[PDB]
RNA sequence: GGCCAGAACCAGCCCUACUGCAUUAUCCUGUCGGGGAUCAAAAUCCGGCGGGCAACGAAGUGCAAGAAUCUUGGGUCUUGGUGAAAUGAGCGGAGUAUUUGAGCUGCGCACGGCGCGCCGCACGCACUGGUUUCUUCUCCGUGAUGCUCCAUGUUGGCGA
RNA sequence: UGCAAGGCCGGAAAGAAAAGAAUUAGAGGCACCAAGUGGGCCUUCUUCGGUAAGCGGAGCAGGCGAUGCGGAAUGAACCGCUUAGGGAUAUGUGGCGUCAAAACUUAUGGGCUCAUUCUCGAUACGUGAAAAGGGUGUUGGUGGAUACAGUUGGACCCAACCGAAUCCACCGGCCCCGAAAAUGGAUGACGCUUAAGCCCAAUUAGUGAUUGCCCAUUAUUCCUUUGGUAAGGGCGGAAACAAAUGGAGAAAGUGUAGCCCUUCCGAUGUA
RNA sequence: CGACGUCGCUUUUUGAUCCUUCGAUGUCGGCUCUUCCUAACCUAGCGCCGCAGAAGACGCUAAGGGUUGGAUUGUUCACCCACUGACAGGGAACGUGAGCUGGGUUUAGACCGUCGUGAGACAGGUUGGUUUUACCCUACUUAGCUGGAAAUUGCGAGAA
């Protein structure tokens, strides 16, 4: 019956998308991974060397170790009553730089830019107003919402 | 429901119709008749000046409305009972064995029906007059006379039901005492 | 008794956005026990007709429409109901009532008793007061008679609650136990 | 009397009475035209036009904050008391006023027709604006030199 | 002077703005040493084998086991609610004809139903009793056709008298037939049919507004007990005061008749 | 009456399961005796027929009454002989073993055939093989004594 190997139950998981097959591109090779970076572990099915286990597909963690052809990632791993910090050894082709902190980094750089403009006599952008407030609505087009006999005839097939 | 449904009947010159709590009495010549209709729950009225009998059903569905044309037929039947009477002529039909019917006073005895040795006896109520016609005029005829249609029949029916062929083909063996003419006395 | 349904006019639209800076405003007619059910029925029509969700729209008004003065009238109610066996069944029925809400409340009790239809399976299409000469049903047209009268028969007249008794003398009004 | 019962009052709770603001128009009227049915009408019904409050015991519509003190509600055998510190708009002293709402209004600004400044403004915001026509009571006050518990009514019945 | 890494020295810090722009009965982490378990079972949804099973096997989650209480007559598991021991007031599920508390059989609400020997119906779970098929039983829809019509009567397969509404197909609601088992028996029993049945809808009823009523080990509140991951105050005897004729106490405290007082929260449970 | 399809009912058959019982619920049949069911064989009524009569087929209401004697077999079944109006089908712990019987099943002795090297095994055949207890409580059957309407009491008072 069902067996438990390294690649068991990975028929659709370790498969390339339709018309998106092929070995990884040049921009993957030129991407710089550093220790301390957040990375997504997504197995490339065309490489089949340094591949992560099926659990770590879709998991993201920080890089703890960089090696000539490989990357070390620390991944959380809920085991019974606690989560373990697991260090997986994969090739560089199975990791992507993570945009998980992109919105937070953009928020930090907005604050410094706002601070600089505020300290030195500059025009800050106007504050956004809530859309949930009230007001007077002047409707250009007003229609009658009602059920018609045509609605019931339409829904009958054949 | 229908708010008001009614039936109208015309009363002839010599007959009087009285209603009192759904109890109808019809008195013409040759007798008087009574009907207890307290099971019907209708509004019966008599207009003496215009000589008309009306029955009304207020706020009725189909079932109570069917009972006002039944009432109109019943009261009509008493009108033609105490004006003209009811006469039922009943004939005995046989293939081989003559059916000997003997009518005494209010008593009917039937013998030799299909050769049987059992005598069938029927006692006619005093409100129905039973007679045997002259065999010279017409052969094997018995006549029931009375004012009540429901009573003149049910004597002709009881006579018919007692001469029923048993354990034989009924399509063959057509012997019996069947009612032929339903007419009036006058 | 006063009707259990109220005449509501719910007015609403989809919230203005970049795709729809000036959305269409829709006026909806519903007969509901309260305005919370009225708004629920308004957003059910908006979703299944105009593809607008209650979470992406706003309500401009949910007021009650005032009844006309009480006059004995004939009301044409265009109504529909859903059953699993037959699907959608749309009927036009005539009612004798004094108000639009009373006629529609009567039509809801009528569809419940005769067709076992509940409120949320029923859709009212139109209610209007029609003249006597446009009435098709004989059961409604029998009340147009210029001189219409009838006796009150088979009536169970209960006593005033204060004056009701348990045991009463047979042919008197005296109360033995009360 | 440490027993039984009834009424008084206190404090706290728990119930009821007493209601204002907004809303209406698919509405209310009158009149013309149609349409309707009658013995003849009227009405139900559809249109144009003129006015509008179906009117606060109008509406079964949204929200209600109304000091049970004025203006002696009820219950507490569902609490504890009889003033052994009563913190009260309720106790005690003063005073006959202030202010907070409703009317009515000033200027400016917001807001709404129409357009780059005229009209309106239901009466919003600031002057905690102006008037006082009516509607309200407002102002002071008692530490524990009590660490803790217990101990203070009235009227009968029963108990000499 | 670039990249990588370990630091050092400074800077800035809405301590995270505004756009719907979180919330928390949110003290985080770390050990040590031990017990009972290691037959389970049942449900809403997903689900495999089997004709199925009160059958065997799984997924997420609740529950019973381990737990009564209030309800569905009865029932380990359904429904309500979960449990210190007492009161009052409100509820929940379920009810308001009697049994049996509540509509002493409520309304100044609307429809439908008649069921002759397992005797209509009033069974959520509970299939914890029913199908295909049928009904000119009644009362509602939809689409057509006819209308001096349809039906009688006279004349001869066909139109004239007659004087009004008829009939064709198809869908529902309730009721009926389908509908046969062994002790006498079961809407719980009686009984109920201007229901005390079914669907819908109210709360003293077109009058003037938005809480009819009855039942909990639940909710609110009051009294008392008990234990806190409990929170605080007092504890240097203020002064004065014999009997015959205001009193007593006041412990620096885990646990006592608890040092005393105030306050808040929890309280069931098999192994 | 009813192919191809299709919808059901029953629990008098087998299967499936493994809920109760392994400090024990006596395990087949027959005899005996009672009772219940109806899917009705005869008996009472009645429809319908390819219903002339006679005999019969199909169906309805109805379980009040009845439903035998034997050869072979432990047999339930099966089969035949005979009578009859008819010799229907079933349940009650596959009703009924402190009611019987013990033919069968079902130990220990022994024979056979097949199987096994063997001891031994065979829903294969054969022959022989302990059937215990009521005096208890109910239930039934008869047989006695005897109070009691506030069903013992209240004095609590109702006349077919
Ligand atoms: C009092 C008591 O124990 O009754 C228990 C309760 O659980 C209920 N029934 C149990 C007794 C019982 C009765 C009949 C049985 O059927 C016969 C059978 O199959 N085998 C026989 C043959 C044994 C000898 C072979 N060497 C047998 O075992 O008796 C089976 C078991
Ligand atoms: K005294
Ligand atoms: K299972
Ligand atoms: K209570
Ligand atoms: K009713
Ligand atoms: K059917
Ligand atoms: K029908
Ligand atoms: K304590
Ligand atoms: K045994
Ligand atoms: K024998
Ligand atoms: K017979
Ligand atoms: K047994
Ligand atoms: K035996
Ligand atoms: K043997
Ligand atoms: Mg898959
Ligand atoms: Mg994939
Ligand atoms: Mg014959
Ligand atoms: Mg008025
Ligand atoms: Mg004062
Ligand atoms: Mg174990
Ligand atoms: Mg219970
Ligand atoms: Mg009662
Ligand atoms: Mg039940
Ligand atoms: Mg019964
Ligand atoms: Mg019950
Ligand atoms: Mg405990
Ligand atoms: Mg077949
Ligand atoms: Mg099992
Ligand atoms: Mg034993
Ligand atoms: Mg035992
Ligand atoms: Mg036994
Ligand atoms: Mg039968
Ligand atoms: Mg019989
Ligand atoms: Mg018998
Ligand atoms: Mg013998
Ligand atoms: Mg059996
Ligand atoms: Mg025995
Ligand atoms: Mg024995
Ligand atoms: Mg033997
Ligand atoms: Mg041997
Ligand atoms: Mg021997
Ligand atoms: Na009537
Ligand atoms: Na069960
Ligand atoms: Na429980
Ligand atoms: Na101590
Ligand atoms: Na406590
Ligand atoms: Na079985
Ligand atoms: Na078993
Ligand atoms: Na033997
Ligand atoms: Na033997
Ligand atoms: Na004995």
DSSP assignment string, B161-175: HHS---SS-SSS---
Residues 6+ apart with CB under 8 A from B114: B94, B97, B165, B173, B175
Cα separation of B12 and B28, whole Å? 9
Mark whether B and A touch (3+ CB pairs within 8 Å). no
C143 near A CB under 8 A: no
The token duo for A42 is 């997504």
Whether the beta carbon of C96 falls within 7 A of nucleic chain D: the reply is: no
Q: How many CB atoms lie within 10 A of CB C64?
A: 14
Cα separation of C9 and C66, whole Å? 10
Report the C-alpha dihedral over residues C28, C30, C32, C38, rounded to 10 degrees. Answer: -10
DSSP string over chain A: -----TTTT-TTTT-PPTT--SS--HHHHT----TT-EEEE---TTT-SSPPPGGGTTEEEEEEEEETTEEEEEEEEEETTEEEEEEEEEEGGGEEE--TTHHHHHHHHHHHHHHHHHHTT--PPPPP--TTS------S-EEEE---HHHHHHT---
How many angstroms does the Cα of residue B168 sit away from the middle of ligand 11? 15
C65 near A CB under 8 A: no
How many angstroms does the Cα of residue A56 sit away from the middle of ligand 16? 14
For B63 and E137, how far is CA from C1' in angstroms? 10
Nucleotides of F under 7 A from a protein CB: 46-49, 51-54
Residues 6+ apart with CB under 8 A from B183: B87, B88, B89
Closest nt to residue A32, judged CA to C1': E3
CB–CB contact A145 C49 (8 Å) = yes
Q: Is A140 left (phi over 0), alpha (psi -120 to 50) or beta?
A: alpha
Q: How far apart are the first and last CA of chain C?
A: 29
Cross-strand bridge partners of residue C111: none
Residues 6+ apart with CB under 8 A from B30: B82, B83, B85, B147, B185, B186
Q: How far apart are the first and last CA of chain B?
A: 43
Q: Quote the minimal CA–CA distance from C141 to chain B in Å.
A: 10
* Nearest in space to C29 (alpha carbons), one of C44, C14, C42: C42
Whether the beta carbon of C161 falls within 7 A of nucleic chain E: the reply is: yes
Closest nt to residue C133, judged CA to C1': D36
Q: Is the dihedral of CA C16, C17, C18, C19 positive or negative?
A: negative
Query: What one-character DSSP code corresponds to residue C69?
Result: P
Resolution, rounded to a tenth of an Å? 2.9
Q: Tell me the three state secondary structure of residue C1.
A: coil
Q: Are B81 and B35 in contact (CB under 8 A)?
A: no
Residue of B nearest to C151 (CA): B58
C151 near B CB under 8 A: yes
Cα separation of B71 and B51, whole Å? 17
Residue of C nearest to A151 (CA): C49
Per-residue b or e along B48-81, where b marks 16 or more CB atoms closer than 10 Å to that residue's CB:
eeeeebbbbbbebeeebeebbeebbebbbbbbbb
Residues 6+ apart with CB under 8 A from C69: none
- The residue written with tokens 């076992």 in the block is C116
The token duo for B18 is 């009285």
C27 near A CB under 8 A: yes
The token duo for A17 is 């998308």
- ∠ CA B128-B129-B130, nearest 5°, is 115
Cα separation of A75 and A60, whole Å? 7
Q: Quote the minimal CA–CA distance from C137 to chain B in Å.
A: 12
Cα separation of C79 and C129, whole Å? 15
Write the residue in C142, C151, C153 that is nearest to B2 by C-beta.
C142
Residue of C nearest to B2 (CA): C139
- Chains that contact B by 3+ CB pairs under 8 Å? C
Cα separation of B178 and C104, whole Å? 62
The token duo for B183 is 């007419």
- ∠ CA C155-C156-C159, nearest 5°, is 130
- Strand (E) or helix (H) holding B93: strand B86-93
Q: How far is CA C151 from CA A93, B7, C55, in A?
A: 97, 17, 57
Q: Are B178 and B87 in contact (CB under 8 A)?
A: no
Cα separation of C139 and B4, whole Å? 11
- CA-atom Rg of chain C in angstroms: 23
For residue C52, the chain A residues in CB contact (below 8 A) are none
Closest nt to residue B167, judged CA to C1': F51
């Amino acid at each position: 019956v069902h067996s438990y190997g390294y690649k068991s139950g990975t028929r659709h998981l370790f498969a390339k998308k339709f018309r998106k097959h092929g070995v990884p591109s040049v921009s993957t090779i030129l991407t710089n991974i550093k220790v301390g970076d957040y990375v997504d572990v997504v197995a490339d099915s065309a490489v089949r060397e340094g591949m992560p286990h099926k659990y770590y597909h879709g998991r993201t963690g920080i890089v703890w170790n960089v090696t000539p052809r490989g990357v070390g990632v620390i991944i959380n791993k809920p085991v019974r009553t606690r989560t373990l910090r697991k260090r997986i050894c994969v090739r560089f082709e199975h990791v992507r730089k993570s945009r998980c902190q992109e919105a937070f980094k953009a928020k930090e750089h907005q604050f410094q830019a706002y601070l600089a403009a505020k300290k030195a006599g500059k025009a800050l952008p106007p504050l956004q107003k809530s859309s949930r407030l009230g007001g007077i609505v002047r409707p250009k087009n007003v229609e009658v919402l009602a059920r018609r006999v045509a609605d019931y005839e339409a829904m009958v097939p054949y | 429901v229908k708010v008001k449904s009614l039936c109208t009947l015309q009363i002839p010159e010599g007959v009087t119709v009285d209603v009192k709590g759904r109890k109808v009495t019809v008195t013409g010549k040759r007798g008087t008749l009574t009907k207890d209709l307290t099971h019907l729950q209708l509004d019966l009225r008599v207009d003496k000046k215009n000589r008309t009998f009306t029955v009304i059903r207020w706020f009725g569905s189909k079932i109570p409305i069917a009972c006002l044309n039944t009432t109109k037929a019943h009261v009509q039947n008493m009108i033609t009972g105490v004006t003209k009477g009811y006469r039922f002529k009943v004939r005995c039909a046989y293939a081989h064995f003559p059916i000997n019917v003997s009518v005494d006073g209010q008593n009917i005895e039937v013998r030799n029906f299909l050769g049987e040795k059992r005598v069938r006896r029927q006692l006619v109520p005093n409100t129905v007059k039973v007679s045997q016609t002259d065999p010279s005029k017409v052969k094997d005829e018995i006549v029931f006379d009375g004012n009540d249609l429901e009573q003149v029949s049910r004597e002709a029916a009881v006579l018919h039901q007692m001469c029923l062929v048993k354990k034989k083909d009924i399509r063959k063996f057509l012997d019996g005492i069947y009612v032929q003419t339903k007419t009036n006395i006058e | 008794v006063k009707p259990h349904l109220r005449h509501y006019q719910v007015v609403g639209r989809e919230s203005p956005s970049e795709k729809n800076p000036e959305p269409t405003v829709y006026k909806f007619e519903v007969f509901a026990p309260n305005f919370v059910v009225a708004k629920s029925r308004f957003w059910r029509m908006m979703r299944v007709k105009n593809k607008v969700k209650a979470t992406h729209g706003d309500v401009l008004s949910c007021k009650v429409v005032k009844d006309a003065k009480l006059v004995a009238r004939n009301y044409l109610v265009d109504i529909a109901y859903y059953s699993q066996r037959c699907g959608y069944t749309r009927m036009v029925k005539e009612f004798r009532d004094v108000s639009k809400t009373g006629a529609v409340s009567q039509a809801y009790h009528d569809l419940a008793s005769r067709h076992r239809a509940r409120y949320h399976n029923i859709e009212v299409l139109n209610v209007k007061s029609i003249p006597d000469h446009e009435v098709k049903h004989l059961s409604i047209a029998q009340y147009h008679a210029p001189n219409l009268s009838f006796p009150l028969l088979q009536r169970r007249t209960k006593a005033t609650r204060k004056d009701r008794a348990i045991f009463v003398k047979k042919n008197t009004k005296r109360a033995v136990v009360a």
